[PDB]
Every structure is written in C-alpha cells, then in structure tokens.
C-alpha cells in the first residue's frame, strides 16, 4: 500500500462505535491484572498513549510484567514459518481481561467442588450426539408440505 506507517490502513480499524465515543470509564481503570493473566489486546482510540501496534488487535496474550499505568503482555505472532513471542508494553486502556478460560475455570471449580463436597456430576462436556428412539404420541396432525405454483407477480413484486 506504499505507506507502512504505525497506523496505516486503520480508518475502519481505529474508529470508535456508533454512539460509543468518549474516553474509557472507571471500570477500565478498576480492573486488576496479575502476572500470568490472559488479556485481549484491544486498542482504544480515545487514548493515544501506550497503544499497541495494529498487528496485535485481536490477539490474546498473557501478562508477564505489570508497570504503574501499563502492563506487559506476551502475544504469539506467526512471522512466516515460526511463531515469535512478541512482548508488548500496552497501557491497560487498550487491553481487557480475557474470558477465554472462563468456561474452563467454571468447569474446574464445579468438578473440584463436586469431589470435595459430594454433590454434582463433574462435567465432561461431550458433543451433541445422536438421539434415541421415541414413540412420540403427538396429537398434532401433519401439515402438507410440498412445492407451490409459481407466480411471476408474487416473485417480482413492485
């Protein structure tokens, strides 16, 4: 595209949402990050400082460093045939606590409370499988399904 700036091809990318402008609220600042935490690197255009590069826009990393106003995150980046562990120093306005492990932690806490108290059935999370045979009394009478006559008007309404 014959201009590779730090914010090239980011008209739609770094645009806020419809009726979503304004600097971030206090829920963004009252969040708490610890080393090892998983975080979505999601740039906030209302804050022009500490921004990550556009190449870490939807990347989930893990926290390795916590500074006063910013946080260090380790994000994997496929270069061409490798993966490199990029280190970003991104302020906490451009990062969110990732729920990527929320279901897993819910399930683990469930199974551990099961095996600690003796109640529950220890989720194993199989897929949605085939069903069994039913006899299905089912008063309802079937509706005649079939093709219908073609009407040029009802197709090309005007």
């Amino acid at each position: 595209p014959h201009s590779w700036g730090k914010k090239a091809r980011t008209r739609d990318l770094f645009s806020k949402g419809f009726r979503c402008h304004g600097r971030p609220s206090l829920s963004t600042y009252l969040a708490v990050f610890k080393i090892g935490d998983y975080v979505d690197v999601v740039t906030d255009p209302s804050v022009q400082k500490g921004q990550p590069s556009k190449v870490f826009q939807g990347k989930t990393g893990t926290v390795w460093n916590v500074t006063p106003r910013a946080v260090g995150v380790l994000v994997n980046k496929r270069v061409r045939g490798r993966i490199v562990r990029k280190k970003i120093s991104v302020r906490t306005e451009h990062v969110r606590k990732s729920r990527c492990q929320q279901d897993f932690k819910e399930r683990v806490r469930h199974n551990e409370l099961v095996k600690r108290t003796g109640v529950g059935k220890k989720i194993k999370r199989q897929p949605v499988g085939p069903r069994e045979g039913q006899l299905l009394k089912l008063r309802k009478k079937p509706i005649p399904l079939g093709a219908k006559k073609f009407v040029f008007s009802e197709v090309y309404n005007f």
Partner: protein, 91 residues
Amino acid sequence: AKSKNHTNHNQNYKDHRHPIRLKGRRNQISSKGLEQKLKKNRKKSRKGFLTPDVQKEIREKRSKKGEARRLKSYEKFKAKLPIWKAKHKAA
C-alpha cells in the same frame, strides 16, 4: 527487462513444510524487562528466606499452638459418640 517483482504464492507451502511452532514454550522468560521494584523485592525476599528445617519446626509449633483445646474437645466428642450411635440404632 521488466520483471514481475512481488508474489506470495508458494509461501504458505514453504512455511508449512515443517510445523509452525514457538521455539521455547516451556522455557522461562528472562527477568530483564520486569519491573525494577519487583526484581529488587524478589532478590531481597530470597535473601531473607528461612531454611526448610526452621520452616518445618515453625509449622510444627503453629500446629501445636491450639492443641490443648483441640485434643480436649475432640476426646469429649469421641466420648459422647457411642451415645449417638446407640440413639441412631433406635430408628
């Protein structure tokens, strides 16, 4: 004379010949870059670390602290147990 310069044609094939992996995934990452206060505090903490034998006897003492109460109450409960068992019989 005039060439056909840029192309990304065989690049995924070359890049996928061998598995696309991270070189060191289990390896630790250096402490360089970590915040200076946290590095200094790790150093000083480890300096102050007690030894495993001192820690073992510390934990032993902590366990022995509330022992006169615990053993007494437990033996009282154990004494009252057979009455409970004989009452549960009558059910």
